[PDB]
């Protein structure tokens, strides 16, 4: 039997959902408000491409943080753990958010809900191989067709990762994650997805994401090896700097 979410859970559901919604760029009118980045930009670490990603990455980062603050549990954490959680899941959530905005017709991703870029563009933009990882994910998420809720829940779970280095209230964070996961699992039961093995398949994505943020971390090291330190926005640095 498939246990649908409880009343105490629906409260958390509407909470997280609203949290994601108010913080996802372009809302539900992203397709029309997106602009294709010039095909010339980033040809086969393109200074130009990079400068454009970094020129719009700081709002994304903040928008991520805003999603966290709209979550009571997260607001119950010490500032120490509060910072660590973000620094970790930051790249992961943004990736998710970008990947769930994949358009098969165009084979492009929508950064900040306004910038469409291709696999190549995002690859030469500093991500390199990560770009593939991300597009591929987006491709995979296409058949899932997740809604704001299901995406919000993933972000939620990603945030509450009780294995980030330097955490204090570990058993506290883990409890939160367990709460989300419970509701997450019940919500999809409610959704009644007709595809076989939806919940597991979805959970594997969490693996994929955690691997993206990781390759991204190694990318950042190489980025400050090639690209100058001035080409990096302050907020960005703080986020992936040790």
């Amino acid at each position: 039997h498939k246990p649908e979410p409880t009343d105490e859970e629906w409260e958390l559901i509407k909470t997280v959902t609203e949290a994601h919604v108010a913080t996802n760029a372009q809302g539900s009118h992203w397709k029309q408000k997106r602009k294709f980045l010039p095909e010339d930009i980033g040809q086969a670490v393109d200074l130009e491409a990079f400068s454009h990603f970094t020129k719009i990455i700081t709002p994304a980062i903040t928008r991520v943080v805003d999603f966290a603050k709209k979550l009571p549990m997260f607001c119950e954490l010490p500032c120490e753990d509060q910072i660590i959680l973000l620094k970790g899941c930051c790249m992961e959530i943004m990736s998710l958010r970008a990947a769930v905005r994949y358009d098969p017709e165009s084979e492009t991703l929508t950064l900040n809900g306004e910038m469409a870029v291709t696999r190549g563009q995002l690859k030469n933009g500093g991500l390199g191989v990560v770009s593939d990882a991300i597009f591929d994910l987006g491709m995979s998420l296409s058949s899932f067709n997740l809604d704001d809720t299901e995406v919000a829940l993933l972000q939620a779970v990603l945030l509450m990762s009780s294995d980030r280095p330097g955490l204090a209230c570990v058993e506290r964070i883990e409890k939160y994650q367990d709460s989300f996961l419970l509701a997450f699992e019940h919500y999809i039961n409610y959704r009644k997805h007709h595809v076989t093995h939806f919940w597991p398949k979805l959970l594997m994505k969490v693996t994929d994401l955690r691997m993206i943020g990781a390759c991204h971390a190694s990318r950042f090291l190489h980025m400050k090896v090639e690209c100058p330190t001035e080409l990096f926005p302050p907020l960005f640095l703080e986020v992936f700097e040790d």
């Binding site: 903040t62 943080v65 603050k69 500032c79 509060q82 910072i83 973000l86 620094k87 302050p234 907020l235 703080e238 986020v239």
Partner: peptide, 8 residues
């Protein structure tokens, strides 16, 4: 520990 704090 910086801009993150003020954003909190």
């Amino acid at each position: 520990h910086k801009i993150l704090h003020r954003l909190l």
